[PDB]
Paper text:
[name] can also bind to [name], thereby inhibiting its ubiquitin–ligase activity on p53, which physiologically destines the latter to proteasomal degradation.
The 11-residue Ex3 loop was found to adopt three conformations, all characterized by extension of helix α2 of one or two turns. Ex3 contributed to the formation of a large positively charged patch contributed by lysines 63, 66, 81, 82, and 85 and arginine 64 from Ex3 and flanking regions in the core [name] fold. In addition, the “canonical” phosphopeptide-binding region of the [name] domain was remote and completely distinct from the Ex3-coded region.
Numbering used by the authors:
A (entry chain G): 1 to 7
B (entry chain A): 25 to 171
């Protein structure tokens, strides 16, 4: 971690 | 590391690094997907340089800037912007279980339509310190995204 913001 | 956080918001957070390069990876996240990409690049720089010596494919002395807007890598020698990564197309980041100075992040590349790891070796710091800074970036980014 961490987990990025991508959508 | 609180100062690290305020630095991320103010475009003041930086790290001396060696930029290893990018590699195709099959997933957006994975602590091991990263470890692998590190081992790939590190085994490429060993394949070349069996044939081309100290020259290729040499990892590049640079500075990593970490902001809420993006990540930037600037060459120390030419002061050229080497990497301009939009923070919004970054899926995951992580330090490395077997390489203590290593840090990498996965990101989507929309033209080639694939996941791309981007590995670094910290010069003065630990991999986890960098990963923390970029998590703070991710956070400021998520906080600013309005409904």
């Amino acid at each position: 971690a961490y987990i990025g913001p991508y959508l | 590391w609180q100062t690290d956080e305020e630095g991320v918001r103010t475009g003041k957070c930086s790290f001396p690094v060696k930029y290893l390069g990018h590699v195709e990876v099959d997933e957006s996240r994975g602590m091991h997907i990263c470890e692998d990409a590190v081992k790939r690049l590190k085994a490429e720089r060993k394949f070349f340089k069996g044939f081309f010596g100290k020259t290729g494919k040499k990892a590049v002395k640079a500075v990593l800037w970490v902001s809420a807007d993006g990540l930037r890598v600037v060459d120390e020698k030419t002061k050229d912007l080497i990497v301009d990564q939009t923070i919004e197309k970054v899926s995951f980041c992580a330090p490395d279980r077997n390489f203590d100075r290593a840090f990498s992040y996965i990101c989507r590349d929309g033209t080639t339509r694939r996941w791309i790891c981007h590995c670094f070796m910290a010069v003065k710091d630990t991999g986890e310190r960098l990963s923390h800074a970029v998590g703070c970036a991710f956070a400021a980014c998520l906080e600013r995204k309005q409904k």
